[PDB]
Amino acid sequence: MYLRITNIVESSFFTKFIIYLIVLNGITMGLETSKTFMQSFGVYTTLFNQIVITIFTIEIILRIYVHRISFFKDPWSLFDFFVVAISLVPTSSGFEILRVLRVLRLFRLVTAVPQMRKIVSALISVIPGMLSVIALMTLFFYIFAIMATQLFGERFPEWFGTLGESFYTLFQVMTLDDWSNGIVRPLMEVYPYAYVFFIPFIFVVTFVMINLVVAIIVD
Amino acid sequence: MYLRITNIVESSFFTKFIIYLIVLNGITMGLETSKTFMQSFGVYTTLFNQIVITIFTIEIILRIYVHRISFFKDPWSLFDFFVVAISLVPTSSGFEILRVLRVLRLFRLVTAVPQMRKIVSALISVIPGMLSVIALMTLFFYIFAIMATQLFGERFPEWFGTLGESFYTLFQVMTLDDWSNGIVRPLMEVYPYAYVFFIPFIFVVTFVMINLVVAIIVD
Amino acid sequence: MYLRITNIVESSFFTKFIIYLIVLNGITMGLETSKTFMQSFGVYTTLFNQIVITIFTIEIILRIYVHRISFFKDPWSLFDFFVVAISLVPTSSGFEILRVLRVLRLFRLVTAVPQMRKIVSALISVIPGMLSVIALMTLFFYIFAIMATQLFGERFPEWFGTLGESFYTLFQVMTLDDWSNGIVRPLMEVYPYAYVFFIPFIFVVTFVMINLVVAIIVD
Amino acid sequence: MYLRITNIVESSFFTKFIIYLIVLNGITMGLETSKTFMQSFGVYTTLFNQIVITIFTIEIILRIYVHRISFFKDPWSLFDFFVVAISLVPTSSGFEILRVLRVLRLFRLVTAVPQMRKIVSALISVIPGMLSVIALMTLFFYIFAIMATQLFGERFPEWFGTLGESFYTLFQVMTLDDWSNGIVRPLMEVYPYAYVFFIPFIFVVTFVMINLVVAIIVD
Numbered sequence: 077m078y079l080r081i082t083n084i085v086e087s088s089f090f091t092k093f094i095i096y097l098i099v100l101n102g103i104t105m106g107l108e109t110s111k112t113f114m115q116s117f118g119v120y121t122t123l124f125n126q127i128v129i130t131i132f133t134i135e136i137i138l139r140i141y142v143h144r145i146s147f148f149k150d151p152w153s154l155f156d157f158f159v160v161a162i163s164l165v166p167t168s169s170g171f172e173i174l175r176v177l178r179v180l181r182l183f184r185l186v187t188a189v190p191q192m193r194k195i196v197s198a199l200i201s202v203i204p205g206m207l208s209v210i211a212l213m214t215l216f217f218y219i220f221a222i223m224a225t226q227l228f229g230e231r232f233p234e235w236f237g238t239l240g241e242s243f244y245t246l247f248q249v250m251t252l253d254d255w256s257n258g259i260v261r262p263l264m265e266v267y268p269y270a271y272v273f274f275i276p277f278i279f280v281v282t283f284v285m286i287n288l289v290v291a292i293i294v295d
Numbered sequence: 296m297y298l299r300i301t302n303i304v305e306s307s308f309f310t311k312f313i314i315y316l317i318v319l320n321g322i323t324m325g326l327e328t329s330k331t332f333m334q335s336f337g338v339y340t341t342l343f344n345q346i347v348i349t350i351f352t353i354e355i356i357l358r359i360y361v362h363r364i365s366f367f368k369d370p371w372s373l374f375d376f377f378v379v380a381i382s383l384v385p386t387s388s389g390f391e392i393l394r395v396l397r398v399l400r401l402f403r404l405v406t407a408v409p410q411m412r413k414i415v416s417a418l419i420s421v422i423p424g425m426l427s428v429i430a431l432m433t434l435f436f437y438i439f440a441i442m443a444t445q446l447f448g449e450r451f452p453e454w455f456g457t458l459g460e461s462f463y464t465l466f467q468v469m470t471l472d473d474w475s476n477g478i479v480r481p482l483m484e485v486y487p488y489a490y491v492f493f494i495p496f497i498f499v500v501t502f503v504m505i506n507l508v509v510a511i512i513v514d
Numbered sequence: 515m516y517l518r519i520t521n522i523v524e525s526s527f528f529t530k531f532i533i534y535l536i537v538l539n540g541i542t543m544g545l546e547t548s549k550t551f552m553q554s555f556g557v558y559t560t561l562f563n564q565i566v567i568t569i570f571t572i573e574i575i576l577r578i579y580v581h582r583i584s585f586f587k588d589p590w591s592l593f594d595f596f597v598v599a600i601s602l603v604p605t606s607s608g609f610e611i612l613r614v615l616r617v618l619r620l621f622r623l624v625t626a627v628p629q630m631r632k633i634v635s636a637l638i639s640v641i642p643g644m645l646s647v648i649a650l651m652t653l654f655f656y657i658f659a660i661m662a663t664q665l666f667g668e669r670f671p672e673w674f675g676t677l678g679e680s681f682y683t684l685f686q687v688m689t690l691d692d693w694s695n696g697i698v699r700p701l702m703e704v705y706p707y708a709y710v711f712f713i714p715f716i717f718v719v720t721f722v723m724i725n726l727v728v729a730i731i732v733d
Numbered sequence: 734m735y736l737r738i739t740n741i742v743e744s745s746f747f748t749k750f751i752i753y754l755i756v757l758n759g760i761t762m763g764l765e766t767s768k769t770f771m772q773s774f775g776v777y778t779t780l781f782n783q784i785v786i787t788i789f790t791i792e793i794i795l796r797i798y799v800h801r802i803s804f805f806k807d808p809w810s811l812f813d814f815f816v817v818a819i820s821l822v823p824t825s826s827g828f829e830i831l832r833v834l835r836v837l838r839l840f841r842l843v844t845a846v847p848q849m850r851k852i853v854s855a856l857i858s859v860i861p862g863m864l865s866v867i868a869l870m871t872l873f874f875y876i877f878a879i880m881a882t883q884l885f886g887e888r889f890p891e892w893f894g895t896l897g898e899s900f901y902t903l904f905q906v907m908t909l910d911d912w913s914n915g916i917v918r919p920l921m922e923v924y925p926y927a928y929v930f931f932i933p934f935i936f937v938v939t940f941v942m943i944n945l946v947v948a949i950i951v952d
């Protein structure tokens with residue numbers, strides 16, 4: 077049982093079969109967005125979907141029989157598992173949010189094609205070093221979202237009315253998005269000195285980012 | 296036998312000759328953007344344009360005989376062929392869009408000047424290195440684009456009603472252009488949790504951009 | 515007395531205890547954001563503040579005795595002093611900015627954690643080589659803030675009414691924030707040549723920044 | 734006697750005297766922005782301004798006598814001569830824009846301190862290596878500005894009606910400033926395929942700039 081399977085799963089037909097299906101699922105998945113296509117030829121796709129989800133599910137079980145415990149020490153394999161799991165509950169009508177996360181199964185093309193798997197991997201490896209600067213900036217953000225809710229949330233509740241809202245606005249400013257004519261200049265109509273909160277915030281927030289990148293470059 | 300033409304063309308005089316026609320036409324084409332000038336100089340420049348396309352056409356024909364199979368495997372010359380081809384498509388044969396693409400021919404100044412070529416050659420050379428990333432990025436856009444249409448299209452048809460539109464909106468968010476007050480904030484009036492899609496989207500797409508750029512540096 | 519006091523403050527138990535308090539007071543400050551909660555539990559936390567600021571007050575007092583004159587040559591410790599001291603000025607005195615400046619004590623997580631201390635010094639470390647670039651820019655900004663105020667402050671007071679105002683708008687244009695549809699297209703309606711001011715300005719300002727970034731890498 | 738003066742100009746008292754002066758005139762021109770100041774002390778500052786303009790004209794006369802033809806191959810002095818000349822043309826009888834140009838002499842602070850001069854030369858020095866890329870791109874803009882005037886200048890004159898207008902708008906898109914909700918979405922209400930034009934453009938202009946920064950950094 078273990079032995080007949082092992083020769084199937086590692087073959088250039090098993091992975092090729094699965095990979096071809098991903099590209100197919102992904103083209104049909106574009107089509108599922110058209111309400112035109114749905115009326116005449118979409119009953120076709122809902123079941124096509126269910127064949128692939130079964131085909132992937134069987135594939136995963138086999139790979140877990142073959143690789144056993146070493147399956148769940150593979151981040152790429154773990155991804156495939158969790159991506160195919162949540163992608164298994166039928167549309168049902170219990171809820172709608174779970175239905176749209178399903179498209180994430182096109183990210184299997186990344187797990188299974190080697191050129192792509194390494195860039196992603198190369199990219200992730202930049203992150204562990206940055207995890208200090210991220211934490212720092214979040215604490216920095218945190219100290220500042222608190223300053224902002226209390227300072228501006230009474231006259232500008234949409235922007236700063238809530239800790240959450242304050243973070244959101246604070247993120248926006250960092251990306252420099254309609255930040256002045258759009259947020260600070262109004263803020264300044266009530267609170268003329270709001271510029272003492274946001275220009276420092278901007279220098280700092282931008283300084284750290286540039287240096288986060290320099291440290292990326294050098295490292 | 297008929298070397299002599301082959302001799303004729305390669306002349307140092309000849310080459311800067313076709314360059315001088317480019318620079319003159321490039322100037323005259325700017326002038327054609329002015330309403331004043333074309334009325335009282337139009338036939339002079341509608342004529343001057345017809346001459347140049349012909350000489351360029353004969354120039355293209357001659358160069359083929361000398362190089363044979365090699366001509367159509369020269370990147371700079373293939374370009375040369377087609378932007379010349381465009382002006383040979385009839386002016387009243389379809390829409391007037393082809394009349395506008397004629398001005399793509401001023402780029403021959405890029406193909407005809409080695410320092411131009413050198414930058415262009417250098418720049419493109421960056422690209423094969425990035426073919427893996429572009430594939431990744433385009434896959435990522437494609438995936439997040441589908442989710443948008445099924446998540447936001449019916450209440451926001453202009454921005455998300457459709458894949459191409461969703462693509463577009465997502466491309467816009469990636470240029471960080473008015474993304475929050477202009478798109479995501481409205482979205483949040485009806486779909487309060489929209490910050491969960493668009494902010495991760497921002498983090499990821501900004502991230503890949505930043506890091507890839509480093510790669511051009513190290514390489 | 516001397517060595518016993520010197521021995522608990524330097525202890526690993528003390529600072530962990532203090533840190534835990536920093537982490538607690540910070541979560542608590544996040545809690546004062548839901549005004550449902552604050553009207554329902556705020557008295558517990560307004561004095562919770564006071565005893566937290568008490569313990570921190572003690573630690574500050576001991577460390578000065580323990581390090582004597584060597585305390586006040588330490589930038590990180592000085593900061594702690596000041597960031598706490600501020601919080602000792604009465605919440606009903608001066609004005610209500612002081613109440614908000616109290617949140618900066620949360621920057622002690624950086625002070626009291628050496629991994630954080632690691633990051634910051636590195637960052638701070640890049641500034642001295644930049645001072646020279648910083649100086650030139652500010653003089654540049656200052657001249658143009660003068661030029662802009664005399665030119666546009668009359669018909670456009672919000673933006674250029676005052677040197678301080680032109681300073682703000684120019685920083686805004688620098689961040690490249692809604693600089694065209696939002697500021698200079700309107701200027702150009704009265705002063706059609708306004709582009710001769712802002713576009714050169716942007717070339718310079720954008721140019722210096724890049725090279726500044728380049729300078730950082732090399733430095 | 735002999736060139737008694739020649740000894741003095743070099744003297745590290747003469748230069749320091751001018752720098753102290755510029756900074757005074759720089760301080761003066763600032764206060765000239767206060768509408769209130771120009772009442773209370775407006776007469777005092779014109780006096781101060783006229784002496785300085787004279788002293789500087791004198792300082793320029795001496796320096797040319799000493800350096801002769803070598804004065805007019807020093808860019809810094811050439812800049813100084815034309816910057817001093819400007820502040821001397823009559824305040825009336827014509828173009829009062831020139832009344833504003835005379836603030837450019839504040840750029841003398843740079844002129845007389847050999848650090849800023851050093852930085853500026855350092856800065857200027859990266860431009861020739863870039864000059865190539867400036868030419869391709871300018872060529873690219875010129876060609877696309879032409880394309881945009883012919884395609885969108887009819888129904889959208891404010892933005893693209895004139896070549897200069899297409900340049901200005903196109904520069905803006907490049908600066909990525911409010912480009913979708915602000916330019917391309919409107920166009921697209923009339924011309925649905927306008928994204929096939931601007932989106933590649935956006936790719937190209939952004940691709941080039943990033944590789945440009947890279948070329949600066951490695952060397």
Ligand SMILES: CCOC(=O)C1=C(COCCN)NC(C)=C(C(=O)OC)[C@@H]1c1ccccc1Cl
Pocket residue numbers: 271272275676677678679681682685
């Ligand atoms: C040239 C005078 O600028 C200042 O003194 C200001 C300071 C001095 O603080 C310097 C800290 N950056 N804070 C900053 C930052 C301001 C500014 O406008 O620049 C962005 C102001 C300002 C002054 C007068 C009228 C309005 C304003 Cl808003």
Ligand SMILES: [Ca+2]
Pocket residue numbers: 252253254255471472473691692910911
């Ligand atoms: Ca913006």
Ligand SMILES: [Ca+2]
Pocket residue numbers: 254473691692696910911
């Ligand atoms: Ca904007």
